[PDB]
């Protein structure tokens, strides 16, 4: 008695083996293949964050678990998961073409990024729907944002609440909370992209959630181009906040990400770790949601809401 529905889970993507780095970054660099120095430098980073294999598995587990859960909490519909990656196969157009091949006519999409943006979120849905239209007989509902989902905000609030309830008295009373997210060219300003503000909102909600009045909103993992990108970067803000206030500790919350990917493992656990260690401050970084049930639940709910269920 259950209706059938595809579940299109979209993510940025991560290579599956040290051997896919090249092509993966060529796609990010938009056709320009990295140089033997940079590329070789990248391999080092992965080899440093423990490896590449674990990253891609985290996203595959998120879709399975979300599908499986969505089918336990409700019985009106039966979901079938389809991962749609942006920079590494299976690409969004491949997952879509597949569902159609499996006889699915209804679908709901949910990208693994809480905020909305004309560059990433809306782009992912765009390409999906067009693949769908080009084939027909297959429709797709798409979730734009979900950073404001109680269960999601709460997942971070409790993490951050524990992080502050571990620091010694002097830190806990002289700390700074930093909410980050992937940076994007400032050019998205011309289209009213609510991305900047959603980041400020998740910030305010989480800081407001843990009873922390001291906090900031930074960006990170910005690409390289001539035109300006969203600022200030967490590294510049973490050193700027210090030189003026002298915080004894900084707790980072990469709310823009949901798994342990180079963006959090390196750009945070290292590069920001490099700066706190430089200014003599303590470094905190609550664990990412990943495939933890509290998170899975959070998403399930988001999907159910989009369907009026
Ligand atoms: Fe700001
Ligand atoms: Mg950087």
UniProtKB/Swiss-Prot annotation:
Assigned EC number: 4.99.1.9
Residues given in the record as Mg(2+) binding sites: 19, 45, 267, 271
Name used for this protein in its record: Coproporphyrin III ferrochelatase
Oligomer and partners: Monomer. Interacts with frataxin/Fra.
UniProt entry keywords in alphabetical sequence: Cytoplasm, Heme biosynthesis, Iron, Lyase, Magnesium, Metal-binding, Porphyrin biosynthesis
Ways its activity is controlled: Stimulated by Mg(2+). Inhibited by Cd(2+). Inhibited by N-methylmesoporphyrin (N-MeMP) and 2,4-disulfonic acid deuteroporphyrin IX (dSDP).
Result of altering residue 12 to M: Changes the metal specificity of the enzyme. Can insert Co(2+) into protoporphyrin IX at a higher rate than the wild-type enzyme, but loses the ability to insert Cu(2+) and Zn(2+)
Species annotation: Bacillus subtilis (strain 168)
Pathway the protein takes part in: Porphyrin-containing compound metabolism; protoheme biosynthesis
Localization per Swiss-Prot or TrEMBL: Cytoplasm
Binding-site residues, Fe(2+): 182, 263
GO molecular function: ferrochelatase activity; metal ion binding
Pfam families with a match to the protein in the record: Ferrochelatase
Superkingdom assignment: Bacteria
Positions annotated to bind Fe-coproporphyrin III: 12, 29, 45-46, 53, 124
The reaction(s) this protein catalyses: Fe-coproporphyrin III + 2 H(+) = coproporphyrin III + Fe(2+)
Main location: cytoplasm
InterPro entries per UniProt: Ferrochelatase, Ferrochelatase_AS, Ferrochelatase_C, Ferrochelatase_N
Cellular component GO terms, alphabetical: cytoplasm
Record bears the keyword Lyase: yes
NCBIfam families assigned: hemH, PRK12435.1
Broad EC category: lyase
BP-aspect Gene Ontology terms: heme biosynthetic process
Effect on the protein of changing residue 86 to A: Retains 92% of activity
């Amino acid at each position: 008695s259950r209706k059938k529905m595809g579940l299109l889970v979209m993510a940025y993507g991560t290579p599956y083996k040290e051997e896919d780095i090249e092509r993966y970054y060529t796609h990010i660099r938009r056709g320009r293949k990295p140089e033997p120095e940079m590329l070789q430098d990248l391999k080092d980073r992965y080899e440093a964050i423990g490896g590449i294999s674990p990253l891609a598995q985290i996203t595959e587990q998120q879709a399975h678990n979300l599908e499986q859960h969505l089918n336990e909490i409700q019985d009106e519909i039966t979901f079938k998961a389809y991962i749609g990656l942006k920079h590494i196969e299976p690409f969004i157009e491949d997952a879509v073409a597949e569902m159609h091949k499996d006889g699915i006519t209804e679908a709901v999409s949910i990208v693994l990024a809480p905020h909305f943006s004309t560059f990433s979120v809306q782009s992912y849905n765009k390409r999906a729907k067009e693949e769908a239209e080009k084939l027909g007989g297959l429709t797709i509902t798409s979730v734009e944002s979900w950073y404001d989902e109680p269960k999601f905000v709460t997942y971070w609030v409790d993490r951050v609440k524990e992080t502050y309830a571990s620091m010694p008295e002097d830190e806990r009373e002289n700390a700074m909370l930093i909410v980050s997210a992937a940076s994007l060219p400032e050019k998205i300003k011309e289209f009213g992209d609510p991305y900047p503000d959603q980041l400020h909102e998740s910030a305010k909600l989480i800081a407001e959630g843990a009873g922390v009045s001291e906090y900031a909103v930074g960006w990170q993992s910005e690409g390289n181009t001539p035109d300006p990108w969203l600022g200030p970067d967490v590294q510049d803000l973490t050193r700027d906040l210090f030189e003026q206030k002298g915080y004894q500790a900084f707790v980072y919350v990469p709310v823009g990400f949901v798994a342990d990917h180079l963006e959090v493992l390196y750009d945070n656990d290292y590069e920001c770790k490099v700066v706190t260690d430089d200014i003599g401050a303590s470094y905190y970084r609550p664990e990412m949601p990943n495939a933890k049930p509290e998170f899975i639940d959070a998403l399930a709910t988001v999907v159910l809401k989009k369907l009026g269920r």
